Design a protein around this ligand. Structure first.
Ligand code: HEC
Ligand code: HEC
Ligand code: HEC
Ligand code: HEC
Ligand code: HEC
Lengths: 449, 72, 37, 218
């Protein structure tokens, strides 16, 4: 169909998108109030879990001596991997000249930043001496020491910091002209200065828009290899390690695909309510959700191919350790997660080949929810199960999470949803410009036919 | 705020005679499991027992000791 | 295209001030972090 | 001009510049405070409960430092002087004096005179005194002229910078033995030459071995 529904003018774009922010704060809808109250409650669960993590130590988690990376690193890889599809809409679709990114890239960039804020606490939080996190950063000290810089956590620190800063930069340049519109309609005098210095007095103009498209296309060209590498490096903190299930050569493209897959699941699960509850049906059409299910289907096939590559690596090899990896994943004590992985991330994705399954909104929402849960299960199968059973059978032990792993997970959900709710309150969730430009491009296609 | 607390440090009133402070001394003793004693070398750190080794001259300790002597 | 401050009289001493900022601040971190112990 | 006044451009440029400068200044604050002579207690004459005078005993009265620190060339721990060390002199050299009531309170009751540690390491660093004095490094390369000190201050902060500076270039501070000689010693002009000869003569090992972590930390 069409990515934008008709009956829309530039006044209508600015009215519909711009008036979801700059509403009076006492006129704020009660559904937003309920969601933000739930997010505030879960953020207090976060603060309690982080407090007991800091006081007692990292031993409140279920980690033991074989599994040094339990549920904390799993949630780290899941939360960082959610950001790939948001950056995909942000940068890669900007590079590929894709017409469906024009209504999504604001929400995509926003949840990339919020998943980055949720992920980036986990390298600090999983230390157990977290106040020395700056030792992984090359800083001038009186000691004269350095980070090792050949470790993959040493790559992780640069990687998450650069990724956080570039995604913040892309958000700010993507937000400057929408700041310029929201300053121009705010109707309260003090709020006009607040969105004014946010816009920097953007002054939407040629010789300013030239540098706008030029820098945005070029930053998309910078961030497009960057998010692939940053999730390759999140892969590489297993892929350089000598554990049998972790030293797999397919891991950087397979973790990149799993990241886009889980992130597209999350963008589904958090934009079907944004499409329905906030009346943005014309801006986010059904063809939008069709093409997003198609891209999720692509990455799901590449992830299922990665599972096949793991099965082929374990069967083709004559090593005992890869074969016992496949046995303990298939018939071991933690084999439930691997069976739920092939039920979730493999069986439930074959529905998305058919158009009516893609166009059905409840089916699409529930299948995206299974994608997110089974993606988490894939991180569990990669990390925990391979750390359970290793080279020496004396160093074999089961991993059981405590209440504090789940407490921190639910609390990071609270931090994510809280930051998302402030985002959808003060700032607009659809790019006002680049939808007006998309309106221009749509009526120009309707002109030249 | 200061890098460390003051760290008071206490010397002797009459020094121990045959030891240089900061050097462990090894003393020979005997530790009995079921009455039957094995000859041990016990490290004297600053006049207190810290580590039990085997007395190499003894029968039932030809250098080494059992675990109960080590956890004495 | 040229910037809009290309033909301004402020473009000489402001961009001289960025490097006089650099050689003051960065050399201050050099003095503190290498020559101050 | 619709929202902002005329000098909004001035205030915004000054505000971005000021934000950069306060970031630089806060980094300077943190670095200065972590290297400050207050933090590491450097060149601060920390008061002892008797006010022993090294200036009066070593430069004036003239006792060698192995008389009181008898363990300086045998152990890691240079011996802190007991009460009896004072009492060889101070049972006769003006006892019944107010400056020695703590010293005479000890050696009668057994409680130690509770001295305050001036040079302090963080206790997993494991300094060894015997190998430093034995390999030609004297006091006043690490303690300064203690012989002139009425109350002793820490001369420099015991960093990994300073310790690794001598563990990477030992030729600059090594001396032809005479480790325990009084601080009348001066390093000569040919410190590179005589330092290289004394490094090769004492068996001072390459810096790839002396900067190892299990050299000091254990
Ligand atoms: C002789 C070899 C000494 C020993 C060891 C210590 N002290 Fe002494 N001290 C000595 C003399 C000959 C003098 C100067 C003359 C004088 O008595 O004034 C000092 C000086 C002091 C003083 C002042 C007075 C005194 O009774 O000696 C004090 C308080 C002092 N030195 C402190 C001190 C302490 C705490 C000692 C034990 C480590 C110590 N001295 C040893 C002679 C000698
Ligand atoms: C120069 C004035 C030095 C200072 C400061 C420190 N050390 Fe040193 N020390 C120095 C030398 C030249 C040597 C022996 C060289 C050799 O052949 O090894 C030492 C000896 C030590 C050792 C012995 C370990 C070893 O030799 O393998 C250690 C562990 C040691 N010193 C500890 C140490 C610490 C903790 C220091 C900082 C306060 C330190 N030394 C400073 C020269 C110098
Ligand atoms: C003696 C020459 C050392 C060597 C070799 C190393 N360490 Fe050290 N370390 C030593 C000193 C004298 C200091 C100064 C204490 C201070 O903080 O100023 C340090 C410092 C460190 C610290 C900071 C300690 C802390 O903040 O808890 C660390 C973490 C440290 N050094 C690490 C370290 C490593 C990894 C080493 C092997 C390459 C190493 N040090 C060697 C003494 C010495
Ligand atoms: C070089 C490094 C030196 C050398 C040449 C001397 N001292 Fe020692 N000294 C040194 C340190 C790091 C310390 C404190 C110990 C610590 O772990 O921080 C000291 C301290 C002393 C002490 C205190 C007790 C102790 O060492 O544990 C005494 C006593 C002392 N110094 C005496 C002493 C004398 C007489 C020296 C000349 C031969 C001398 N030190 C040299 C570092 C260094
Ligand atoms: C009575 C003879 C006396 C002799 C000689 C003497 N000291 Fe001391 N020294 C003391 C006493 C007592 C202390 C502990 C009190 C203090 O910390 O000041 C001490 C401790 C020190 C301390 C303090 C270390 C610490 O952390 O507390 C320094 C520094 C020191 N001696 C250096 C020297 C040197 C170097 C010499 C050799 C020239 C020397 N002293 C000779 C009595 C003596």
């Amino acid at each position: 169909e069409a990515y934008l529904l008709p009956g829309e003018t530039y006044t209508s774009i600015s009215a519909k998108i711009g008036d979801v922010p700059l509403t009076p704060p006492l006129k704020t809808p009660k559904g937003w109030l309920a969601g933000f109250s739930v997010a505030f409650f879960m953020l207090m669960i976060f603060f309690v879990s982080v407090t007991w993590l800091f006081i007692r130590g990292v031993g409140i988690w279920g980690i033991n001596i074989p599994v040094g990376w339990g549920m904390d690193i799993i949630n780290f890889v899941w939360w960082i991997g959610i950001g790939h599809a948001g950056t995909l809409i942000s940068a890669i679709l900007l590079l590929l000249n894709q017409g469906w990114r024009n209504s999504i890239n604001r929400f995509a960039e926003a949840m990339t930043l919020f998943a980055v804020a949720c992920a980036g606490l986990y390298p600090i939080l999983h230390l157990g001496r977290p106040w020395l996190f700056y030792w992984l950063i090359p800083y001038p000290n009186t000691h004269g020491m350095w980070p090792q810089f050949r470790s993959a956590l040493a790559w992780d620190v640069f990687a998450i910091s650069t990724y956080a800063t570039v995604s913040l930069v892309f958000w700010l340049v993507g937000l400057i002209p929408d700041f310029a519109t929201l300053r121009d309609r705010a109707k309260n005098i003090w709020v006009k200065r607040l969105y004014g210095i946010a816009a920097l007095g953007w002054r939407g103009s040629a010789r300013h828009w030239h540098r706008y498209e030029m820098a945005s296309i070029l930053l998309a060209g910078l961030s497009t290899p960057l998010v692939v590498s940053v999730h390759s490096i999140i892969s590489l903190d297993f892929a350089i390690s000598q554990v049998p299930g972790w030293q797999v050569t397919v891991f950087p493209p397979y973790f990149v695909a799993g990241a886009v897959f889980a992130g597209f699941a999350m963008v589904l699960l958090l934009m079907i309510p944004v499409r329905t509850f906030y009346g943005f049906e014309n801006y986010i059409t059904l063809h939008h959700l069709d093409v997003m299910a198609k891209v999720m289907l692509t990455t799901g096939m590449i992830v299922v191919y990665g599972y096949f590559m793991e099965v082929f690596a374990s069967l083709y090899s004559g090593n005992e350790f890869e074969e016992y990896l496949l046995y303990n994943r298939l018939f071991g004590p933690s084999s439930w997660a691997y069976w739920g992985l092939l039920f979730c991330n493999a069986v439930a994705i074959q529905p998305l080949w058919f158009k009516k399954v893609r166009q059905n909104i409840p089916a699409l929402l529930i299948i995206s929810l299974i994608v997110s849960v089974g993606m988490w299960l894939e991180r569990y199968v990669i990390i925990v199960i391979s750390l359970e059973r290793d080279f020496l059978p004396s160093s074999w032990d089961i991993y059981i999470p405590t209440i504090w792993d789940w407490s921190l997970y639910i609390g990071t959900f609270g931090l994510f949803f809280t930051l998302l709710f402030l985002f959808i309150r003060v700032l607009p969730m659809i790019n006002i410009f680049e939808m007006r430009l998309f309106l221009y491009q749509e009526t120009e296609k309707a002109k030249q036919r | 705020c200061t890098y460390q607390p003051r760290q008071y440090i206490a010397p002797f009133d009459r020094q121990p005679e045959g030891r240089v402070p900061g050097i462990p001394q090894y003393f020979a003793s005997t530790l009995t499991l079921g009455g039957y004693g094995t000859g041990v070398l016990v490290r004297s750190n600053e006049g207190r027992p810290t580590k039990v080794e085997g007395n190499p001259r003894h029968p039932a300790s030809l250098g080494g000791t059992d675990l109960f002597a080590q956890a004495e | 295209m040229q910037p809009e401050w290309s033909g301004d009289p402020e473009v000489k001493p402001v961009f001289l001030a960025v490097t006089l900022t650099g050689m003051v601040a960065f050399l201050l971190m050099v003095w503190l972090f290498a020559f101050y112990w | 001009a619709q929202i902002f006044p005329r000098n909004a451009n001035l205030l915004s440029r000054l505000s971005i510049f000021a934000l950069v400068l306060l970031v630089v200044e806060g980094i300077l604050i943190l670095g200065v405070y972590f290297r400050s002579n207050y933090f590491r207690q450097v060149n601060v004459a920390i008061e002892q409960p008797v006010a022993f005078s090294h200036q009066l005993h070593v430069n004036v009265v003239g006792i060698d430092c192995r008389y009181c620190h008898t363990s300086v060339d045998q152990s890691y721990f240079a011996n802190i002087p007991a009460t009896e060390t004072c009492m060889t002199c101070h049972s006769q050299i003006k006892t019944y004096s107010p400056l020695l009531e703590k010293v005479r309170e000890s050696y009668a009751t057994g409680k130690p005179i509770e001295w305050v540690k001036v040079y302090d390491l963080p206790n997993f660093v494991y300094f060894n005194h015997s190998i430093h004095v034995n390999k030609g490094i004297g006091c006043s390369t690490c303690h300064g002229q203690v012989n002139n000190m009425p109350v002793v201050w820490q001369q420099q902060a015991l960093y990994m910078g300073w310790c690794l500076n001598c563990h990477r270039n030992p030729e600059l501070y090594v001396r032809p033995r005479e480790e325990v000689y009084n601080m009348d010693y001066v390093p000569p002009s040919n410190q590179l030459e005589i330092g290289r000869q004394l490094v090769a003569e004492y068996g001072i090992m390459p810096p790839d071995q002396l900067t190892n972590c299990y050299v000091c930390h254990r």
